Design a protein that fits this description.
By secondary structure, the chain is mostly beta strands. It folds into 2 domains: about 5-175, Acid Proteases (Cathepsin D, subunit A, domain 1); about 175-330, Acid Proteases (Cathepsin D, subunit A, domain 1, Beta Barrel), CATH 2.40.70.10. It has helices at about 115-120, 145-150, 230-235, 305-310, and strands at about 5-10, 15-25, 30-35, 40-45, 70-80, 85-95, 100-110, 125, 155-160, 165-170, 185, 195-205, 210-220, 225, 245, 250-255, 260-265, 270-275, 280, 290, 295, 305, 315-320, 325-330. The strands form 3 sheets. It has a 7-stranded mixed β-sheet with strand order 18-17-12-13-22-14-21. A 6-stranded mixed beta barrel has the order 2-3-8-4-7-6. A 4-stranded antiparallel β-sheet has the order 15-16-20-19, with no helix packed on it. It is globular. The chain binds sodium ion (NA). Its EC number is 3.4.23.22. It comes from Cryphonectria parasitica (Chestnut blight fungus). Keywords: Aspartyl protease, Disulfide bond, Hydrolase, Protease, Signal, Zymogen.
Length: about 325
Amino acid sequence: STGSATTTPIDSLDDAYITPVQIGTPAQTLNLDFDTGSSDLWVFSSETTASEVDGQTIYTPSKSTTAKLLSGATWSISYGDGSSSSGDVYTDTVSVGGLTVTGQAVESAKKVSSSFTEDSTIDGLLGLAFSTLNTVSPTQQKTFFDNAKASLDSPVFTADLGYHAPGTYNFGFIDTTAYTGSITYTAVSTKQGFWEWTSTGYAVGSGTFKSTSIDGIADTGTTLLYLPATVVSAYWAQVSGAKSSSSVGGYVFPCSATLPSFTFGVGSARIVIPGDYIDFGPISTGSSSCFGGIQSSAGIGINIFGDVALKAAFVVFNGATTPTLGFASK
Ligand code: NA
């Protein structure tokens, strides 16, 4: 089997992407944030504290003939941005882009933090990291990909995120029409539960490539590219008037600037992030200070190849017995 679903930016900045997901019988369609940096499929629901719901579509298990309470199971998760959610668990039928899993754990939120409530466009998360990170207790649950894997034509999924445009998540096949040149595959460590890999270096604009190992994670649920402070300083030094602002919480730059590209290495291959991808717009409405899309990972304890990086590539998440990542230009 295969599946193929379109993923759509939630706003004009590509702050996140949402993908429609069918849950239950008859189908309830929720727009979920597919997150290769976490491993829980959780949804706003009929159980979510009413004051914490503001415009999201909810899953109502009582209206699904295939829903069943997973008795005694609870979940609670905290993300890198400080947000959190928790609740209880149902199993139900879940379909993505025509690919169906029966008996998928659907984590129903009883509580969500303010940033979830405030984002009316995201109805929950669908985690695509390794199932070792799933938070369900006392019986850890599998991700949608892990449950689908054995049925897929190939044990893979791909992320093809758009810049200011829709893109695609495919399950079970490589769309050889969706990228240019060849796919370069690179090793993955699953030891922290992430799609963790090592980039071979970077370049800023038309500058020379710096060969250096940068360990980090491929994380579709993170908006920005978080790299070591040395790398980030070298990038922003090429932008007149850019500076790190402790008050704003990262590098800012004049909205009048033209940003340089940023290149990262995948083995001997190179992915180029156009400068425009690094512009996250005014820090507050009407400001002439703009927020940068490349930020320091210092204090986060890991480098994160978030959407700024991934949307410059066609990315293969290869879930074979020994997982690997693949990157192609597009
Ligand atoms: Na922000």
